[PDB]
Design a protein around this nucleic acid. Structure first.
Ligand SMILES: [Mg+2]
Ligand SMILES: [Mg+2]
Ligand SMILES: [Mg+2]
Ligand SMILES: [Mg+2]
Ligand SMILES: [Mg+2]
Ligand SMILES: [Mg+2]
Ligand SMILES: [Mg+2]
Ligand SMILES: [Mg+2]
Ligand SMILES: [Mg+2]
Ligand SMILES: [Zn+2]
Lengths: 97, 220, 86, 135, 99
RNA sequence: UGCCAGCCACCGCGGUCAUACGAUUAACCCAAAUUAAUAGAUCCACGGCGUAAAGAGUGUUUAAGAAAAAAAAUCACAAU
């Protein structure tokens, strides 16, 4: 009959889960701009999760979309298309020090 | 000689004989933060019966049980003091080292706060001397050594048939400890509290023994 | 106990033995209380509790130890490794 | 002499038994004291196995309905203006005031969250506390 | 008489909820050169560095305002059965007890 | 005597100080028997299978068995 005992509820305080920059966006091979964000400008490599910072789901979607674009002839393979050089830089890599 | 048996037998027949009930309370303990433990990631398996629960990752010791136990430890400590026996405060924690050495010297009891030499309890006659008395009771204010394993003296006091009081925090292993009192060993008001309590219990017992001795002397 | 000289190890193991003593509860001070089976490492001992007259039928080491304990009537079969310390 | 097996029993057990066998010819002090007021659990050695499989501990997490409220408070207004004093045993925080007001307006029977919350904010502004909120 | 549960439920440490980003009051009980050992009343002291502005105003006994991050700094590391305690708390020293 | 001559069920013994060969002295043990050889009696796993002998390269069904209390068939990604 002790009213001061704890109640077995779920944690009220619990924070929301952090989200990939793209959670519920749509990655489409047709826009080379979004894709070309996750490429190295000099090489054309695709960046890793530990650079892009994506839900495994999106890193995968991004990779597949990239390769698709590259072969359907939307996006260049060996270098990031110079037009998109000055777009926003999402990735964590620093070349020039 | 018969009445010496009287002076040893008499105090065993009352529960409270040194009246230590009145030195603390559940509220007393609570304000000294005693109810606070480590994170649940550090929780030692054998401690779970003493946990009132876990609040947002912190383990909250159950004070009802801390009181229950502490009453018993103090009682035991006192009766050993009354019976003129050696008490050894042991902690290897360097904050309270000075505090404890002080406390002990004030009760007329002994402290080992320093590095515990290997065979101190098991091989006594080599370390200390040709024939020696060994502590009759050992109090641990922290059951751990600065490398976070159990303090040797626990295993070796057990090994030596010496009863052991000790404050076992949430990540300690209580198993080999004769009268454990679950509670917080890390925070200053807690350690200061436990020191003060064991101090008072000892002093009270030694007094009661002096007075009852005096009475026995006037009896004849 | 262990030493370069045999004499020395004898002394050492005696004096050390007296420090680890067990108390063995004896039923009516001759047998054990009830049947025992234990697997210690690779050794299986199996003992059975006898009546008053049936003396000490055991591996010779166990008979030695029993005579030291005071267990006068017993049956034990050891299987697996007969290694003495185990 | 005595028994140095730490693992076999309690010190009580080994001591009493070694006396029983007539090996140990003098009773030790702490023994009589022990018998008189024995500890809650027998101090027998035990090995701390790591849990496995589906097994987990029994420890209950500590929550109260007030928490369910406090979360909305902190999400809205962050920690309060008054800071915290964990030394003062009776100290009440801004969050706790908000709690009590919310509980009182719960007793008037308003089952809507919005009403309760906002009107408790108003009931607090009444007393002179500033809720600066957060975006 | 107050049941332990009753006490725990109303205590300021239960009132706080999660200890991340909480403004708290704490008091300096020890000093080594730039290191202030601050007891904010929870379990473990924290330790902060003496700021550049009004450096000499911080003395043993002083009171200061803290932003609590973590109540105890603890983590599990690769290959360990239990977590490792730093035996400290994580805080940011804001200023001193504006009064 | 000296890796010779020889001995042993198994381990092993004999290279100049052999209780192990050969003989002597003493002893031990069986005894109208005592050794040796050969056949029996007894003896293997209700134990095991990561590293020791052993989980058979894979799946499905047949035969044969188990069902012994509570539920389930199903969604990013490089099957073919
Ligand atoms: Mg601790
Ligand atoms: Mg021959
Ligand atoms: Mg010769
Ligand atoms: Mg022979
Ligand atoms: Mg011969
Ligand atoms: Mg014949
Ligand atoms: Mg094999
Ligand atoms: Mg296979
Ligand atoms: Mg093959
Ligand atoms: Zn996502």
């Amino acid at each position: 009959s002790n009213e001061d005992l704890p109640v077995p509820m779920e944690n009220p305080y619990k924070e929301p889960l952090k989200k990939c920059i793209l959670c519920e966006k749509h990655v489409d091979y047709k826009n080379v701009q979004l894709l070309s964000q996750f490429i190295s400008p000099f090489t054309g490599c695709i960046y890793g999760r530990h650079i892009t910072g994506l839900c495994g789901k999106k890193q995968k979607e991004i990779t597949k979309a990239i390769k698709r674009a590259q072969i359907l002839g939307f996006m260049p393979v060996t270098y990031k298309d110079p037009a998109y050089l000055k777009d926003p830089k999402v990735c964590n890599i620093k070349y020039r020090e | 000689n018969d009445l010496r048996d009287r002076i040893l037998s008499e105090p065993l027949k009352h529960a409270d004989f040194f009246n230590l009930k009145e030195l603390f309370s559940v509220r007393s303990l609570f304000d000294a933060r005693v109810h606070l433990g480590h994170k649940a990631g550090c929780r030692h398996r054998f401690m779970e019966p003493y946990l009132f629960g876990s609040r947002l990752g912190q383990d909250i010791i159950d004070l009802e049980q801390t009181a229950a136990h502490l009453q018993l430890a103090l009682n035991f400590t006192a009766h050993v003091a009354y019976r003129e026996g050696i008490i050894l405060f042991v902690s290897r924690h360097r904050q309270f080292a000075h505090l404890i050495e002080t406390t002990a010297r004030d009760c007329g009891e002994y402290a080992h706060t320093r590095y515990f030499k290997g065979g101190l309890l098991t091989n006594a006659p080599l370390l200390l001397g040709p024939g020696v008395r060994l502590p009759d009771l050992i109090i641990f204010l922290h059951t751990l050594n600065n490398v976070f394993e159990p303090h040797v003296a626990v295993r070796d006091a057990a090994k030596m048939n010496i009863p052991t009081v000790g404050i076992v925090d949430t990540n300690c292993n209580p198993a080999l400890i004769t009268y454990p009192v679950p509670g917080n060993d890390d925070s200053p008001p807690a350690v200061r509290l436990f020191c003060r309590l064991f101090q008072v219990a000892i002093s009270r017992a030694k007094e009661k023994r002096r007075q009852v001795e005096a009475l026995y002397r006037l009896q004849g | 106990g262990k030493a370069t000289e045999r004499a020395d190890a004898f002394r050492k193991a005696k004096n050390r033995a007296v420090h680890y003593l067990h108390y063995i509860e004896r039923y009516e001070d001759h047998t054990i209380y009830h049947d025992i089976s234990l697997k210690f490492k690779r050794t299986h001992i199996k003992m059975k509790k006898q009546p008053r007259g049936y003396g000490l039928h055991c591996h010779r080491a166990i008979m030695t130890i029993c005579r030291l304990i005071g267990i006068k009537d017993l049956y034990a079969k050891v299987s697996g490794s007969v290694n003495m310390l185990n | 002499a005595g028994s140095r097996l730490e693992t076999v029993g309690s010190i009580f057990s080994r001591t009493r038994d070694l006396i029983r066998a007539g090996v140990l010819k003098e009773k030790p002090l702490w023994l009589d004291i022990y018998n008189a007021f024995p500890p809650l659990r027998e101090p027998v050695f035990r090995r701390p196995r790591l849990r496995y499989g589906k097994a987990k501990a029994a420890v209950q997490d500590i929550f109260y309905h007030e928490d369910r409220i406090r979360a909305k408070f902190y999400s809205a207004y962050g920690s309060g203006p008054k800071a915290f004093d964990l030394f003062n045993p009776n100290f009440k925080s801004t969050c706790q005031r908000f709690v009590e007001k919310y509980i009182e307006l719960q007793r008037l029977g308003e089952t809507d969250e919005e009403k309760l919350f906002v009107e408790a904010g108003k009931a607090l502004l009444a007393e002179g506390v500033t809720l600066r909120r957060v975006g | 008489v107050e049941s332990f549960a009753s006490m725990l439920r109303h205590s300021p440490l239960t009132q706080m909820g999660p200890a991340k980003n909480k403004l708290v009051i704490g008091q300096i009980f020890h000093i080594v050169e730039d290191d202030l050992y601050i007891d904010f009343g929870g379990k473990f002291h924290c330790v902060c560095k003496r700021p550049e502005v009004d450096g000499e105003k911080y003395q043993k006994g002083t009171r200061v305002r803290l932003r609590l991050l973590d109540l105890e700094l603890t983590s599990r590391f690769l290959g360990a059965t239990t977590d490792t305690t730093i035996l400290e708390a994580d805080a940011v020293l804001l200023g001193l007890q504006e009064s």
